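Hi Y.,

Following your request, here is the sequence exactly as I used it, all 320 residues.
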Amino acid sequence: DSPLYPLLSAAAEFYKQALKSHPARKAAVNYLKGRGLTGEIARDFGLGFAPPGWDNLLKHLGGDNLQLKAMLDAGLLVENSDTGKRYDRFRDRVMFPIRDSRGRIIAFGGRVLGDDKPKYLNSPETPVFHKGQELYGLYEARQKNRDLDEIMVVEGYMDVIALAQQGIRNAVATLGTATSEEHIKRLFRLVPSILFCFDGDQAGRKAAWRALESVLPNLQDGKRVRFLFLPEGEDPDSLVRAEGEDAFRARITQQAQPLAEYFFQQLMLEADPATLEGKAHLATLAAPLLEKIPGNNLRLLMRQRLSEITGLSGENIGQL
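Below is the corresponding structure, written out as tokens. Let me know if you'd prefer a different format.
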């Protein structure tokens, strides 16, 4: 219970109250209406509106220099570290408040309603917001279902919101970060099954391997992890609005790839085990990764597949 929480909470109350009754609301409300995000979904995710300009939240919250430092530390202001000039971090944007386990607003995402870049702006790291520990939408998914079987991990705010609007309400998002081991530990405390969904771009494919590396040291027996790769140029946002819930669920069932198949596929592309050298190279890449799996059956199962492909024993694999 620190002083950043009330400021963040007041900021959120400001941003959604402007979404309702602010002069510039037209562009914002049209985005939400233009995506079916009105009413139900907007309330579930506390959507708001940051009006255009430099100091709307500043001139609305104010405070002495100690309050101002707390707004900066909460990520609500940007300060020029040379001149001290300060202004709202989030300007002319649709606002996505981020909540922790207890429902407390800890940070914000914002989508631009103009031409200024970046289209999506995250909060910086703050004492109440750590990007490697938090997942956007985790609070909202736990509210919708207390006994979740599976969590879907996606890359962006609108992926979570678009999916929720289509009836897929167990999606959470990393916040422009690689999935961390701490992310995996929190997900596995809630569900035995994680479905990763990656955009059709090179950053999506790189993020899948980093996600697999975060998963391995936390992969106990009886857990289930899969990777769904979307067609080039797509993300869950665009895709699910295009083809709808039923088709996206069919796509998952059809095309989600098991972790173990993704693991051996990618490594066999790096080290082709047709030859004696490729077999040794493949075992040299795989073994240190497999050694980290804590689940004893799964570690044995992956070692066994590696042995079948490479013809190398454990003594061979160890000595290599």
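The first strand starts at residue 48 and ends at 50.

Thanks again,
Q.
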